[PDB]
Amino acid sequence: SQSTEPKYKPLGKLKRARTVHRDSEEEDDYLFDDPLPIPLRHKVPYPETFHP
Amino acid sequence: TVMASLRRPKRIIIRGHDEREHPFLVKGGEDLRQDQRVEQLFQVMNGILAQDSACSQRALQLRTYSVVPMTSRLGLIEWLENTVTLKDLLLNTMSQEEKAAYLSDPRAPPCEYKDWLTKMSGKHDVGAYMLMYKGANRTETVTSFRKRESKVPADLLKRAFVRMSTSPEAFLALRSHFASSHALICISHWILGIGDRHLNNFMVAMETGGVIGIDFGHAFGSATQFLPVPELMPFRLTRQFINLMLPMKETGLMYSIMVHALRAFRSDPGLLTNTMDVFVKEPSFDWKNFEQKMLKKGGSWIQEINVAEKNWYPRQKICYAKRKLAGANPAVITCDELLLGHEKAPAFRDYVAVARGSKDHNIRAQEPESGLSEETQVKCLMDQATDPNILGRTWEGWEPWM
Amino acid sequence: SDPAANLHPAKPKDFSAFINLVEFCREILPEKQAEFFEPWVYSFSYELILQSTRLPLISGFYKLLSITVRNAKKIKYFEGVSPKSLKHSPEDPEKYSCFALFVKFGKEVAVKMKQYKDELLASCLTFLLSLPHNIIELDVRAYVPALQMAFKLGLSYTPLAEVGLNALEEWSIYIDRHVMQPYYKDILPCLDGYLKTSALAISLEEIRIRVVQMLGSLGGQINKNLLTVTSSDEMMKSYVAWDREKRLSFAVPFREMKPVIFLDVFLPRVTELALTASDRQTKVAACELLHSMVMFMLGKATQMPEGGQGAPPMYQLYKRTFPVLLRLACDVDQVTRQLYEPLVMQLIHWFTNNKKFESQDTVALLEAILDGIVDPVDSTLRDFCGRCIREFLKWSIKQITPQQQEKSPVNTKSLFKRLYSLALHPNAFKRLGASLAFNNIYREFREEESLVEQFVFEALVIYM
Amino acid sequence: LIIRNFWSHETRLPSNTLDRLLALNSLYSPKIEVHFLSLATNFLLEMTSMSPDYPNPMFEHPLSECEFQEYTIDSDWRFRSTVLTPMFVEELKMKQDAQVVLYRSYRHGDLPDIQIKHSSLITPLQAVAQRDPIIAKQLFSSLFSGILKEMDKFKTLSEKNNITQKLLQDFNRFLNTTFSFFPPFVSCIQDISCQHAALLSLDPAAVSAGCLASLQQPVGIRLLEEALLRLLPAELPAKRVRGKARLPPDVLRWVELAKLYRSIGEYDVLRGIFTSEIGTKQITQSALLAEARSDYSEAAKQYDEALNKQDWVDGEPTEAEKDFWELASLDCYNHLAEWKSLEYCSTASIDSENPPDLNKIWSEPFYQETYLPYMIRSKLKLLLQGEADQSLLTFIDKAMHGELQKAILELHYSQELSLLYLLQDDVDRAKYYIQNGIQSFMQNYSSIDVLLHQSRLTKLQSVQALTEIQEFISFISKQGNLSSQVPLKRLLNTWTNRYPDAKMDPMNIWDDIITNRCFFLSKIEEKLTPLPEDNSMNVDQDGDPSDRMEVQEQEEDISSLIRSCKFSMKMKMIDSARKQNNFSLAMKLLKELHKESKTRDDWLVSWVQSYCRLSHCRSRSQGCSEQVLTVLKTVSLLDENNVSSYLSKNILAFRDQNILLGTTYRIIANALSSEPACLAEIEEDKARRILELSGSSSEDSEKVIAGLYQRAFQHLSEAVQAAEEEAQPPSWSCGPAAGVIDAYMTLADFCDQQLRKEEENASVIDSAELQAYPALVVEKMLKALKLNSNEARLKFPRLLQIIERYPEETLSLMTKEISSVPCWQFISWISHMVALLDKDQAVAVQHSVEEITDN
């Protein structure tokens, strides 16, 4: 526990929630009613650039 | 006060019991039921634009004034305050040296156009345009029109807006409002088939930069079907309007406004199409009223004898309006109007070719005749409006140079 | 035309006694929760309203009535009288009669307050905006302009701003949304005017905080009306150039060259500072610079141009400047007044001269004076314009020769015809301006015997 | 004054009146940026008095003869306040030595005095310039322009070029070395650079940064456009210079102009700039078209396809196009509320390793401006939705350990800090952050010009959100509201009565408001849990909940009300998104609500109707085959007995479902009629389903169309009969009349379109079944006009045309039914009614014209 002497009170973590499992694994019965899922976004540029 | 314009109307001020003054324009010997019906059509258009989210987020509304007929030969028209004619603004922007040379000077574009018509056609009347249509080539017309455009200052609208404004923010606001108003006016006039858009038919609001359209005499291709010199243009997008957005192109703000307005109009066309159907089938809109109206005013000098003859069919006008409110090519529509009106002419083929294009420099000739999207339709409209081949063969009073 | 002008109490001690009594009643009366004030609401309100009706120029009656209406609301006195004449008196006719009397007095005060100013106005606005929400729910419109004036004056006078904020909050909370919806576009622009000053008695920081919270609590479907006035009409104005060309060319001297600057780009901000500046030093500097530029304009106009062209037309510039000079010559200040009143008199004398006559400059000056004399807000400017019309006629009839008057604008006949037109205008303030003008001319009018014998019957019929 | 005379002395300020401008340009420090214009103007005008033309009078001649008297001096009294005092009634510790000073002199006369000293204009000009930044700005600009124009006459070309280069370097130094960013100073510098030519080569990056900091975007935009127009740096596309890495100078100016236009909020100009100048590929045009069509899914897909593509036949795209693609894909993912994608995209380019190091956000200025807000927003949204992750919070605490990072976090993301703390309890501190956010809103709104509408609208939406944040904080900070149910009821009623604009607010405002409200409801549900750690212990301990389950059975505990409010708010958001033509977001929210919609009959039927409405709106802008597929998905949910059981209980939902099913059938039939072989164009299962739904024994392309039209008419007539059959009270003032009007107009429009279709093309079939169409149109349109429908009022003349075409079917019907419509509903078409008086079919309008003549 590190509340700290000053105002910041930086929080190490969050007591609230932290629930491990959320929502049914089923995740909505009808595939037909809703449209196919958008492709997952992909990006692979070169890092360590100067003023990109 | 007597207004210096055609038919010489007069301006009176009425003091109401609400302790306010109401200026009005008194027009005598001029039926004005068509103007009232067109204003009602614009009100319906304004409602449809207001009920659309994309246009509501940009506040696209056509400025509508009041037209009231009291007699079949006399009526009252609301007078707009702090407004000026676009031609008057362009003329007053020019200096004394510039104004005298365009206004009164040999080799001026107003005189070079007539000299060129005499050169390519041994006539000094309305048949010179027909002979030039039959006897001129695209390259010559384009080169002559560009050389004629080069003789008029290229930043008249920009200089005027700079002179009125005091800060760059005011200049930005005025230019944006002018561009948006002009784009909305252009698309709404093309939907209604309104022609005869010369520089004296536009009024500029000098306090905010807005544009207002007046003097609606032609409707549903009347300038393309019944004039001795046909108008093959959807709206007025000339060199000055292009140069107003000096670093940018017309494919930005104006294109976006026109596309959004056309998309709003094309969604649920039933109300609009029904209103123009009620407009087009009227017992007071006979061919006699049209010929009296076109006879009273000069225009393209329709004369006491009409070559195109009476071909008044309200079913064809509403059919063309419904077709263009769906995916349709503007070149196809104007060629259809030319076929309906100018069939017995010696320059029919040249009319059709000029109005259609060449498939090498025009995007409207590379597209199908129907099923166009809104973006493609607006692109074809802009290409047909800015075509030097069409603009180099127009009526002298239209002034295609400015 | 101002009612509370050149008027003094007959007994100055009685006014001091009344002021002390009102100030004492501010502290003593609202005490004890007003449980004991229950049987005195009608007996206080009737007498106070009668005395205020008999003497409408005393703010103490309005303040006492304000305390009366405030104590009643804690009591709840007007929670069941909204049906009004639908039922005669289910519980008590005293409350119904008090309600009806309160309704009529407030509507009359709102109608009569449009000519008051300063302390009397602040008290009337407080009294009307302290009214219960049922009376406002009757007719919203007569009370709207009161809210607008209270907010506008609260941009500089904090208690009026607080009163207007409380009234707006009460109206938005308790009055039905359907009836209050159309009026928000008239109310929110002055809150925007409050918000624009955030770049620079409850301090204004908490007032702006309350304005922000009120805007947020209204909702996105309403607070957009905060931008209704802007980007339309006047807001575009004063953003346009006074003249499309440049007239005042000034050559700044140096020992080597003479660069040319234009003083017509400074004119709008200089006039704005000379008219409304909080700090006194910048106001004095702006007034002096405006005087110098008026002298420069007059000299440049009167100077014979060296070039082959004609004299530089200063019509547009004179027309914008002449109205500002008229406003400045009747300022609440005295340095501005004694600096600019002789300027206006000298300008009238010069434009009525033999040299500068039958021109659009005299026309511009005369139309500026005649437009100022029909000001529906400022009465001091109206008085000053009446005095300007007298001086104009007095120096017009003397300087000019007996000849050189046929087919000549800006003459006695023409001035009378403009006054006659003003007198027959259906607008109330035009007739008032014409009457004030004639009341300022008649001394000079009666002296000219030849002018009388042709201008008495027509004027009598016109004014009847 | 001593320092001023020291600096104005010779050998420290040359008196050649041209090198003095350069000397004043060199005599500049960022500390005195506020008063620099007044200082420079005073230094320039102080040498005017050394000229021989200074003391002598300016105008040599008076206007006329006027003898001036002795100098009149105003009475310099002590000013007093009079606005706050009793009226009709009958200390100056530092004001007495700070009284009003005066310049020049005056002389009274019967004419104005124009023979004034030449100093009488110079002295007050500088006097008022010292006390006003705007006047000093104008004076400095005018003096600079005049000195430059006059030096043009007395200099050679090489010297002019040298001094212009020196001025350009000085202005670049001014724009690059500043921290106060005084709006008059940057505006003056940029305007002076704009009105000249050799100064048009000013550095675009410094101009953009200064205009972004000081909010002089119009000035920067004007400078950039005149730089693009008048300079003409290079017009050779063949790249005659040797090939190297650096981007072209013109496209840098285009990028800066686009940045300024995006900051000012004009997205159409930005789209045009990216279309015509930045874009050099074909995928870019289609992506921009999709973005302008509000189809963010397709635009994002095309942006990712362009970014991962590794082989280009035409050539490698420029770096500007690639960064525009990345930024536009970030904007598209933000618009779609795809937080998990937005967070990746934002954190993708920081590191090549699988876990990104967030500290490198604070490394480059480019990373801070384009990735930080998106990353913060995505992580905050993911946390507020209920997911658990500490990355954002660890980043926040480690950043506020510093001072520059903490300052620039507090400057902008104060609301995010408030929400982040309020999540992790800390109710006491978050008030400080929300007050800072409100104050920053005040500053930002007050720093924007009044001619820019979009920015002020955006700030209005922002302050709405901030005020709701503060209101919830105030509600939760008091323990009295936790007890009982009246404060929760008040808050719920206020929240459901306070909504963003459906037609005028973007989806970001709705998303923020809805997410914050749902988070607040989750927090108030967590706080109002039973006090013992085991559920229902206190409930069985006390006796009140036992009797509340019997008497108060009408509603349930706070959980049910919270769930109902959440469902209603999310449905309102779904309808708003459907109205704003954002279909992917509406589909996402509809699925997310479907997860739990099937627990109550009214919730289920509301979900089904909203889905069908969204699909109907989606079908409009698609082809015939896509139309058929969309409404074929739609049609499977409106013919189910499980929901028909509830439809038998409520008559309004039955009418709405019948209307929706009739609309679906009409769409199917219209799509089939406008495109033959469309059924053959789709797979056999869908064609067989359409054949079964048609109900026609034949297998041709016309009997199916006729059957679908018959089913559509049957459903619309069933809906109108359900509406008419005493489905509601009379309901004055047209409260619930919207559904009845909708049914009337739907049936009337369907029958009217069918009647129009018969008139256009020549008819060979008898079509005897259409005898009931025109009377139906006239009658139902007349009831709709009675119910105050604007659409019927603008569709009135069609009824007169129908009367003319088919007299004996409906002339008497209209004559009987038109007599009950209010007379003032025919004022718009008064000309037609008075022009339809000498015809045979005039009996209908006689009563109407007599009524309006009487009124």
Numbering used by the authors:
A (entry chain C): 362 to 413
B (entry chain A): 3727 to 4128
C (entry chain A): 606 to 805, 845 to 1108
D (entry chain A): 2519 to 2608, 2760 to 3524
Paper text:
Artemis activation by DNA-PKcs resolves hairpin DNA ends formed during V(D)J recombination. Artemis (692 aa) consists of a catalytic domain (1–360 aa), composed of the MβL and β-CASP (CPSF-73-Artemis-SNM1-Pso2) subdomains, and an unstructured C-terminal regulatory tail (361–692 aa). Even without DNA damage, Artemis exists primarily in a complex with DNA-PKcs.
Here, we use cryo-EM to analyze the basal state of Artemis:DNA-PKcs endonuclease complex. This is the state of the complex after purification, but prior to, activation with ATP and a DNA end and presumably the state that would be present in the cell before the complex is recruited to broken DNA ends. Among the three states, the state 2 map had the best resolved tail density and the strongest signal of the catalytic domain and was therefore selected for further refinement and modeling of Artemis bound to DNA-PKcs. All three states possess density attributable to the flexible C-terminal tail of Artemis (K368–Y407) bound to the FAT domains of DNA-PKcs. Additional but less resolved is the globular density observed in the 2D classes which corresponds to the N-terminal catalytic domain of Artemis, consisting of the MβL and β-CASP domains (approx. 1–360 aa). This density lies externally between the N-terminal HEAT region and the FAT domain of DNA-PKcs. The N-terminal catalytic domain of Artemis is dynamic, even in complex with DNA-PKcs in this basal state. The surface of contact point 1 of DNA-PKcs is negatively charged and the Artemis tail (L401–Y407) appears buried well into the groove between the FR2_α1 (Y2965–N2977) and the FR2_α2 (E2988–H3004). Contact point 2 occurs between positively charged residues of the FR3 domain (∼3252–∼3309 aa) and Artemis residues (D389–P396) (number 2, and 4D) and includes a sharp bend down toward the catalytic domain. Contact point 3 is another negatively charged region in the FR2 region of the FAT domain (∼3057–∼3098 aa) and the positively charged residues (K368–R379) of Artemis interact with the surface of this region.
